[model samples]
Target: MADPSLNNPVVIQATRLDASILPRNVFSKSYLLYVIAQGTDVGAIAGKANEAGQGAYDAQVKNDEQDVELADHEARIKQLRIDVDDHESRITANTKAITALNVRVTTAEGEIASLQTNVSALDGRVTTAENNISALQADVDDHESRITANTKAITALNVRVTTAEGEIASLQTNVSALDGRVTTAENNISALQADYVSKTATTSQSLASPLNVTTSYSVGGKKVVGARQTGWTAATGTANKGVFDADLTFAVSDTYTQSEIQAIANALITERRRTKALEDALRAHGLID
Candidate 1:
C-alpha cells in the first residue's frame, strides 16, 4: 500500500537547502534519519533533501575550478600586455635614433662637398704657380744667350782697345820729342797740327767705345734645375735692382779711391743677386753713378 504522504506533494520552503538543486542518492541516509528523528514523514522530504545537498556540493566544486582557471587566464593576459608595451617603447626609441642618424649623414655629405671644393681651389693655385715658373724659365734662357753674345763681342773690343792704348803711348812719346825740337825752331806749326789731328782721332775712338760690357742671357728651366740666376729678365724679377743700386752709389762718389771703387765693383759683380751684374754694368758705363 502506498503511503498517503508519499502520494501527496509535500510543500517545502525554497530556502531549505539554500535554494540549490541536487541528486537524491548523495545524502539519502542522513536525510532519512533526520526526518525520522524529527518525527515527520520521511517519505515526503527524504528524496528532495538528499538531492539538494548533493547539488550544492557539486556546484561548489564547479565554482572553485572556474575561479582557479579564471585567475590563471587573467595573469597571462596582464603579462602579455606588459610585454607588448615594452616592445612598442623600444620600437619608438629605435625609430628616433634612426632619424638622428639620417640627419648626421646629411651633414657629413655637405661637409664632404665643401672639402672637395677647397681641394679643387688649392689645385688651381698650384697649377698657376707651375705655369709662372715655366714662363720665367724661358725668359731666363733667352737672357743668358744674349749675355754670351755680348761677352764675345766685348772681349774683341777689349783687345782692340789694348792695342790702341799701346799705339797712343808710342805716338805721345814721339810727339814729346818733336815738341822739344819745335821749341828750338826745328819743326813748323803745320807739323804740330798734323800730330794733333792724329792724336785726337785716336782719343776719339777710345772715348766712343764702351768702357764696360754686360751680356743678357737666359737659362732654360733654371728653376727646375735649381740653377742660380745670372741676370734679370722677366724671370729673376725686380728684387735684384735694389742690391745693384746701393753698391753703385758707393762706387761713383768721389768719396772712394779708385782702388776702393774697383774692389767694391768686384765684390758686387760676384754677388749672386740677380741685378748685380747689370747694375755694375750700368755704373761702369756711367749710365748710373
Candidate 2:
C-alpha cells in the first residue's frame, strides 16, 4: 500500500506515500500524451491509405484508394445525394398543398359556424311559433264552442218558427173554406130576394108602408169611411190591391128615383137580403145560435 509499482522498483528505503498526490496508479498525464502520439501515428498511416486527407497525403478523398468497387460505391453515394435533393423539392410542393388544405379547413369551420347560427335562429322562431300556435288554438276552441252553442239555440228557434208557420197555413185554409160557404149562401139569398121583389111589386097596395131609412148601411163590414182598397185581385202574389177610384159618404138625405116608391122598396128588400145571408152563413159555421 505504500510502495510505488511503476518503473520495476528496486529496493530502496520506503517513504510513506502521500495520499494527496495525483499519480495514484501506474498511468499519468504523460502516459495519456504518449498513447495519443501513438494513435496519431497510426491514424496518419490509415488516412494516407484511405482519403489521403491527412498524414503524407493532401486532404481530399476519404476512402481507400485505387479500388474500382470502392469508386462505384462513391458514385452511388453521389447519386443518392441527388435523390435527397429531389425529396427536398417534393417536400416543398407538399408544403404548398398543405397550406391550401389549411385555408380550406379554416373556411369550412367558419361556414359550419354560420350554418349552426342560422339553425339556432330558426329553432328559436319554431319554439316561439309553437307557443303562438297553442294560444291561437285555445282561442279557436273557445270560439267554436260558443258557435256550437249558438247553433243549438238557432235550431230550437227554427223548430218553433216551423210550427207557427204550419199553424198559420192551416188557419188560412179554414178561412178560405168559410169564405166559399159564405159566397154560396149569398148567391142563394140573392135569388130569394129577386123572387120576393117580383112577387111583392105586383101585390103591394098600401101607401102607408114603414120606411125608416135612418139606420147605418153597410155590406161585408165595409161602408163609406176613409179611402179604401179596391180591385182586390185574388190572383197571384204579384198582384197588389189598388185604391178606390172614387168614394163618397152617405148623407142624411139623398134623392133617388127608382120608379119612385116601388124602386125604393126593392132596394130596401135587397139590402135586407144581404143581412139574412150573413146571418145564415154565421149559423152554418156554428158561430151563432
User: Which candidate's TM-score is highest?
Assistant: 1
Model 2 over residues 63-129: C-alpha lDDT tens digits? 2344556788899999999999999999999999999999999999999999899899999999999
The estimated TM-scores of all candidates read 0.42, 0.35
Local error of candidate 2 at 126, Å? 1.6
- Give the range where candidate 2 is weakest over 10 consecutive residues by summed lDDT: 235-244
Tens digit of lDDT per residue, candidate 1, span 1-289?
A: 1123333434453334321244445768677556444544543476576566566656666778889999999999999999999999999999999999999999998888998998899999999999999999999999999999999999999999999999998999989988897786745676765455362343543344443334432346343222234454332323345433334434456474787667777665546555555665654544444
Against the true structure, candidate 2 has what lDDT?
Answer: 0.62
Which candidate has the top score in lDDT?
1
